[PDB]
Amino acid sequence: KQKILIVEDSMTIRRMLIQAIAQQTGLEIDAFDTLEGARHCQGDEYVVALVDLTLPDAPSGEAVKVLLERGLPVVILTADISEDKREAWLEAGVLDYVMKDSRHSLQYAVGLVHRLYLNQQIEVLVVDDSRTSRHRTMAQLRKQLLQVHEASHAREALATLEQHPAIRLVLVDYYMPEIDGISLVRMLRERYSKQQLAIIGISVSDKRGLSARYLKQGANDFLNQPFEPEELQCRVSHNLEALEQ
Amino acid sequence: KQKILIVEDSMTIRRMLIQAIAQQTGLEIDAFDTLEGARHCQGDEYVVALVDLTLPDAPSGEAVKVLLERGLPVVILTADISEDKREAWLEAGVLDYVMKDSRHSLQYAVGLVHRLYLNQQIEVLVVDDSRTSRHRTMAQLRKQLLQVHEASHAREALATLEQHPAIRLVLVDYYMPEIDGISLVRMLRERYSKQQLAIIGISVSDKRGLSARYLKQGANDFLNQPFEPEELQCRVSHNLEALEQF
Numbered sequence: 339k340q341k342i343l344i345v346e347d348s349m350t351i352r353r354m355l356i357q358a359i360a361q362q363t364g365l366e367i368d369a370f371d372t373l374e375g376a377r378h379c380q381g382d383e384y385v386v387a388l389v390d391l392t393l394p395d396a397p398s399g400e401a402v403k404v405l406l407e408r409g410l411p412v413v414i415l416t417a418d419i420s421e422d423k424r425e426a427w428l429e430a431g432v433l434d435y436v437m438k439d440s441r442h443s444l445q446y447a448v449g450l451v452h453r454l455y456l457n458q459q460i461e462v463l464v465v466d467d468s469r470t471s472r473h474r475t476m477a478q479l480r481k482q483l484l485q486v487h488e489a490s491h492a493r494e495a496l497a498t499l500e501q502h503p504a505i506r507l508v509l510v511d512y513y514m515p516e517i518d519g520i521s522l523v524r525m526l527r528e529r530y531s532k533q534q535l536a537i538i539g540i541s542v543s544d545k546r547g548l549s550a551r552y553l554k555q556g557a558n559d560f561l562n563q564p565f566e567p568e569e570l571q572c573r574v575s576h577n578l579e580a581l582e583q
Numbered sequence: 584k585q586k587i588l589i590v591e592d593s594m595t596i597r598r599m600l601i602q603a604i605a606q607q608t609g610l611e612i613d614a615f616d617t618l619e620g621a622r623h624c625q626g627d628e629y630v631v632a633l634v635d636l637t638l639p640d641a642p643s644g645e646a647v648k649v650l651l652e653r654g655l656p657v658v659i660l661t662a663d664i665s666e667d668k669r670e671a672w673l674e675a676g677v678l679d680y681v682m683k684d685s686r687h688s689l690q691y692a693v694g695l696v697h698r699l700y701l702n703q704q705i706e707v708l709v710v711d712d713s714r715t716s717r718h719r720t721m722a723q724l725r726k727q728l729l730q731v732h733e734a735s736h737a738r739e740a741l742a743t744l745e746q747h748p749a750i751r752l753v754l755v756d757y758y759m760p761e762i763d764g765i766s767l768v769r770m771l772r773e774r775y776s777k778q779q780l781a782i783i784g785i786s787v788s789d790k791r792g793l794s795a796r797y798l799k800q801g802a803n804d805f806l807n808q809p810f811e812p813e814e815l816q817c818r819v820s821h822n823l824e825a826l827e828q829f
């Protein structure tokens with residue numbers, strides 16, 4: 339998919355977004371000032387929809403549910419944020435939100451739609467012996483439009499990598515039965531450079547240098563648990579962009 | 584400074600390091616199998632010295648102090664690490680340590696020296712109202728060979744950036760009186776894009792979702808306190824590389 343949907347009645351915001359996405363990403367764009375303009379829009383044509391909560395024919399966020407139910411991933415455009423609003427949106431299945439209170443916050447949308455577009459073709463692997471942790475991380479990576487493989491043990495991870503050599507990034511949990519995180523990182527790096535297979539080591543900063551041990555064994559990066567979805571997206575995106583650049 | 588010193592008696596390891604550093608960095612390399620061989624090397628010519636603890640004439644790590652006192656920054660080459668071993672080193676003046684138990688672990692030194700070379704010409708700013716955290720972060724960054732400016736509050740940060748436009752990366756503490764970290768980030772971003780001035784937001788990871796707040800305000804990155812030096816080095820390196828390549 340090569341097209342971005344924007345539904346936003348502010349002439350200024352809509353134009354800022356079209357100009358920026360057009361110039362920086364070269365992606366196709368449909369932009370409407372009403373939910374009614376976006377009526378023909380189906381999920382299979384758009385990477386993602388950037389959706390205002392203040393539309394003339396949907397003044398209280400109604401466009402969000404409407405577009406989610408047509409199969410469009412949605413990123414909410416918002417002037418305000420709160421803990422309650424964040425939780426509500428994320429519960430309804432919204433991918434993310436973008437602050438539109440300033441031009442620099444609005445710029446977040448531009449890097450995001452470019453990232454989401456590139457992610458569509460990218461295979462990643464989560465390796466974690468905690469089902470709860472594994473499923474949370476997978477869900478969150480799936481909301482980045484990545485194709486996400488799952489493994490509950492290093493043995494499974496190694497087997498999945500052999501079967502799917504398109505996987506380009508692996509997130510690695512530190513403590514697992516038989517073969518722990520650092521040990522799996524050593525095994526992978528005995529075969530693959532940081533440019534062939536990016537590795538993010540999942541750590542805790544309440545240990546005696548787990549992140550350090552990851553890096554000295556050739557992990558591209560670290561991420562400490564517990565982590566927010568916004569932290570995950572930031573860290574994954576960077577490492578994916580390192581691979582492309 | 585564009586030269587590197589290597590003092591390592593393993594033929595295999597020294598040659599691996601020479602090959603990789605010659606191939607992947609623009610650095611000149613002087614390598615020796617004994618400390619005596621490196622006698623006349625002067626501190627002002629070398630970016631860093633990669634230093635074995637097991638040398639024929641310094642079998643218990645004596646070469647580290649010797650080269651430190653010649654004004655060379657030192658990265659230790661070690662076959663095995665403990666928490667007790669990184670203990671005595673960093674409190675002596677070591678830049679970092681590199682594991683030499685495998686080819687892939689050696690490769691960390693390659694990336695490191697390349698980055699240490701590049702960091703010499705790069706200016707950064709630490710903004711933090713806590714004296715100890717501000718001083719430690721400054722010390723750690725200085726160990727990455729960066730040129731490091733400090734600010735105790737947003738007002739001083741801004742004045743510093745005005746006086747030193749070469750600064751390309753700011754690390755911003757969240758809790759500061761009068762003007763907080765997110766407010767400073769907002770002011771900086773009204774003028775400068777993520778490509779013009781990199782911003783790493785430092786916070787504690789709790790219920791306020793501060794990391795998220797930084798990112799949505801245009802911070803390039805986040806780092807949660809408390810953090811280890813390798814964590815800061817990793818983060819700063821990634822952001823500097825982003826400015827150079829993305």
Ligand SMILES: [Mg+2]
Nearest residue numbers: 347390392393
């Ligand atoms: Mg509106």
Ligand SMILES: [Mg+2]
Nearest residue numbers: 467511513514
């Ligand atoms: Mg585990």
Ligand SMILES: [Mg+2]
Nearest residue numbers: 592635637638
């Ligand atoms: Mg030796």
Ligand SMILES: [Mg+2]
Nearest residue numbers: 712756758759
């Ligand atoms: Mg503070």
